[PDB]
Design a binder for this molecule. Structure first.
Ligand code: OLC
Ligand code: OLC
Ligand code: OLC
Ligand code: OLA
Ligand code: OLA
Ligand code: OLA
Ligand code: OLA
Ligand code: OLA
Ligand code: OLA
Ligand code: OLA
Ligand code: OLA
Ligand code: OLA
Ligand code: OLA
Ligand code: OLA
Ligand code: OLA
Ligand code: OLA
Ligand code: OLA
Ligand code: OLA
Ligand code: OLA
Ligand code: OLA
Ligand code: OLA
Ligand code: LFA
Ligand code: LFA
Ligand code: LFA
Ligand code: LFA
Ligand code: LFA
Ligand code: LFA
Ligand code: LFA
Ligand code: LFA
Ligand code: LFA
Ligand code: LFA
Ligand code: CL
Ligand code: CL
Ligand code: CL
Lengths: 225, 225, 225
């Protein structure tokens, strides 16, 4: 079950990479070129993640607990680009963009520590820290990010409402999966945990990528001269 | 002794993070927002460092020598922000900012190698290299950085004199502690070495952070219309 | 044989660092200062690489195969600067610069995985992936990069022809050496592989550095008022 879902991730991320790469190659306009390029690299990074996992790499047995550490390495590179999708579309200011990238980096890094710690009490402390770094981004996203975006696109508040809702709901599922997997309560087996992360990853990367493109189209139409 | 000082670092860095974060949240002005945000992340990074150390992580016994490697990982992230404090305040040019960030990165990286090398003769070679990377920053700071800053703020040369004096004196103490600890002569025990680094870290992060804010206030007053 | 070539690299990279550093110190003009600074750090990074290797560091015996992993760590830092040499000189746009830096980062990262994988079939898969990341840069370099550069310097198309030819020919030799060494067919001994990488590194760093400076001189003369 685990193995098939890892190859599904390889396929899904590769297809995402191809179609965003084609879009980047054909883009009319530097802003479109940038947006396609961000999403291409999100999916290209993840294709490499899923290939490494599918080939059996990136995994260690830590004190008897099988632990996939490689996803934190690539997440640390792809999740800032997903943030960049948001801050590019919302024309976010530099301090708020940096704060979002910093808080997100903090989240992934402490999530990594929460995962690889042999002492699972210590790991669960870092999980809480990581959750508070995530909540920091939530605060930034629904306050400063949203207000700037709505100020920049007064006629497109719904566009950013949908971007934020999809981002927040989907990303909140990750710490839930983490608590369900062998990092926490071990309420689901490894094959189910792998399926969950794979579906989340494809949705949060390929799915959000296409939403960001659709969002861009609406923003440009709303701001046609 | 070591354990208490690690928790003192957690507390001190957390308090620094809180007060810089409050300042960032209330800031009047993008330049103030940026400066508070830089210092928030300096202290937030260090809070995580000190929590990891306080919980017993980030340490290895290398050929019988207890070695705290995690501080080099976080220093590599926080020390460039301390440089950014300086180059933001001094409106430093791009090549000099990059040179400062590069030389500082070189210093921390070779300091890491100087620390983890089992062969302590090799480690001491890297210590010398790291010292010369530090001296490179000294040269850049008291020459190009200072002249640009004084050119940008002709009425505030004292402000940059104090920033540089505090930076240079405090940062020079780090290679001294390193020579005193079990990385060099082992003239002080681990508990004293830990206290020294903790006091240095709190002063160079929380202390320098507040100095940078005071400096900003003086710079803006000197350049009030 | 291996040991002498590692020290030759230390010497050659150190000399490159010194002369680019002198050029940076004397530069007339921010653009010249930037270009000298990029090449200084390329060579300074590599000096540290070659010192670590010369001192016997950065090498592991992986399942019986001596494997120099440290070169991928420093290549990951120096090769983007060589790209920056190109994109600085060609005034490349942001999406194409990012795409070049991203594809190059992908190449080095999968090259690292191709090298350290104990399962050499898996390693050879990553070698192919890394080759396709390199071919991605080739496509970007001879298409978008070149057209932008020729548009920016219509009277200096030969300058970018020489830059690209030297970059492409020299960098293509690296995957050939990799196939010849114990990472692939093991057709040359370690001492010869080390000599090959050392000569390639000195040429692609010190040599390309001086070519980039000569290129800059021609570009500025062609665009003298
Ligand atoms: C800020 C938000 C923190 C999130 C949720 C609190 C509960 C989750 C944190 C604690 C997890 C505990 C856990 O995983 O317990 C394992 C279980 O006891 C099997 O051995
Ligand atoms: C450029 C500046 C270099 C700094 C100082 C020179 C002296 C410090 C470098 C040498 C350190 C030697 C050391 O730590 O010696 C350990 C001692 O012998 C116990 O075993
Ligand atoms: C895209 C470009 C791929 C490049 C070349 C194809 C051939 C190289 C890839 C396969 C290498 C095989 C190899 O190294 O074989 C070891 C040999 O069998 C001793 O044990
Ligand atoms: C791989 C992605 C890593 C993301 C790291 C994010 C770091 C966040 C830290 C923010 C502090 C800096 C805030 C902005 C500084 C601007 C500097 C300047 O204007 O001179
Ligand atoms: C985590 C912090 C890491 C800091 C790394 C610093 C790297 C220093 C290297 C400098 C070389 C580049 C100099 C400026 C390049 C400008 C490029 C351009 O203008 O196109
Ligand atoms: C150490 C060097 C590492 C190089 C990493 C290169 C990353 C390449 C990824 C590209 C995606 C981003 C494309 C440009 C984003 C611009 C963002 C913006 O304008 O807000
Ligand atoms: C087998 C598993 C396949 C999973 C596929 C899921 C997502 C990735 C594919 C997305 C393709 C989008 C194409 C859009 C288009 O061009 O119309
Ligand atoms: C993963 C790799 C992606 C490669 C994408 C190549 C895009 C080619 C576009 C061709 C065209 O539409 O003319
Ligand atoms: C611990 C750190 C994680 C939370 C980071 C918070 C980022 C936003 C703070 C700010 O406004 O500067
Ligand atoms: C429960 C779910 C509610 C929280 C997730 C949706 C947030 C929407 C944010 C917004 O509309 O800007
Ligand atoms: C609202 C959604 C809440 C999701 C909560 C996840 C909790 C995960 C652990 C479930 C508790 C039982 C575990 C067990 O005993 O096997
Ligand atoms: C127990 C050890 C505590 C160490 C505290 C040292 C430094 C961090 C606290 C700094 C607080 C500054 C508050 C400034 C203010 O708001 O007036
Ligand atoms: C470490 C965490 C820091 C969080 C800082 C939160 C700042 C809230 C400011 C509230 C206010 O002053 O209105
Ligand atoms: C060895 C390297 C450490 C020293 C780095 C020197 C940086 C400044 C050089 C310059 O002016 O370009
Ligand atoms: C002994 C200490 C003297 C060196 C440290 C102080 C340097 C001050 C630099 C400056 O005033 O710009
Ligand atoms: C001026 C300040 C100089 C600081 C020098 C630090 C030297 C550290 C080592 C002290 C020498 C004796 C060590 C020993 O034999 O225990
Ligand atoms: C012993 C091996 C030495 C290898 C030397 C090769 C390359 C690095 C030296 C390059 C010096 C360039 C000087 C240019 C000049 O200033 O005229
Ligand atoms: C490696 C180190 C390089 C240091 C370069 C120092 C350059 C000094 C220039 C002196 C001058 O020409 O006046
Ligand atoms: C797999 C990834 C390596 C290839 C990266 C291709 C970069 C250029 C794609 C683009 O035009 O956005
Ligand atoms: C065989 C070698 C030919 C390919 C290498 C040279 C490419 C030149 C590119 C160019 O002229 O822009
Ligand atoms: C055109 C240049 C082609 C370079 C090709 C390199 C192949 C490397 C391996 C050589 C094949 C024989 C290996 C062996 O059996 O020892
Ligand atoms: C745009 C920046 C791209 C950076 C490179 C990302 C490539 C990731 C490829 C997967 C890495 C897997 C590592 C597995 C290590 C196994 C060790 C044994
Ligand atoms: C970006 C880095 C943030 C800190 C992460 C530290 C991880 C250390 C892992 C050590 C593994 C042995
Ligand atoms: C466009 C596609 C977005 C993702 C949809 C969900 C994919 C799940 C794969 C199992
Ligand atoms: C703004 C960028 C922030 C990057 C993340 C910094 C978070 C650092 C937290 C401490 C890391 C400690 C690592 C301990 C590893 C133990 C392994 C066993
Ligand atoms: C930024 C990186 C600079 C070079 C540092 C290399 C460290 C390698 C550590 C290996 C540990 C086994
Ligand atoms: C503002 C406070 C700056 C730091 C003062 C020194 C803290 C030492 C803690 C033991
Ligand atoms: C401009 C950015 C510079 C970053 C630092 C580069 C310094 C590289 C020095 C060589 C590193 C060698 C690491 C050897 C590790 C051995 C572990 C045992
Ligand atoms: C930049 C990083 C790109 C991915 C590289 C993953 C390397 C993992 C190495 C693990 C060694 C045990
Ligand atoms: C100086 C002229 C160029 C030197 C090239 C060195 C090549 C090293 C061996 C490569 C074999 C594929
Ligand atoms: C200027 C020098 C460029 C490099 C020439 C080739 C060096 C080979 C060293 C063995
Ligand atoms: Cl990923
Ligand atoms: Cl730190
Ligand atoms: Cl290198």
């Amino acid at each position: 079950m685990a193995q098939i879902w890892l190859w599904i991730g390889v396929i899904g991320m590769a297809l995402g990479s191809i179609f965003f790469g084609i879009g980047a190659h054909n883009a009319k306009n530097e802003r479109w070129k940038i947006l396609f390029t961000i999403n291409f690299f999100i999916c290209a990074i993840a294709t490499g993640l899923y290939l490494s996992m599918a080939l059996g790499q990136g995994r260690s047995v830590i004190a008897g607990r099988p632990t996939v550490w490689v996803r934190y390495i690539t997440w640390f590179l792809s999740t800032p680009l997903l943030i960049l999708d948001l801050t590019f579309l919302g024309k976010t200011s530099l301090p708020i963009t940096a704060s979002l990238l910093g808080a997100n980096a903090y989240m992934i890094a402490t999530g990594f520590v929460a995962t690889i710690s042999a002492d699972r009490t210590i790991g669960h402390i870092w999980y809480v820290v990581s959750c508070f770094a995530f909540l920091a981004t939530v605060y930034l996203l629904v306050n400063q990010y949203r207000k700037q975006a709505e100020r920049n696109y007064p006629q497109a508040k719904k566009v950013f409402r949908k971007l934020l809702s999809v981002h927040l709901v989907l990303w909140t599922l990750y710490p839930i999966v983490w608590l369900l997997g062998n990092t926490g309560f071990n309420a689901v087996n490894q094959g189910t945990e792998t399926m969950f992360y794979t579906i989340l990853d494809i949705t949060s990367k390929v799915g959000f990528g296409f939403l960001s493109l659709n969002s861009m189209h609406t923003l440009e139409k709303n701001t046609e001269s």
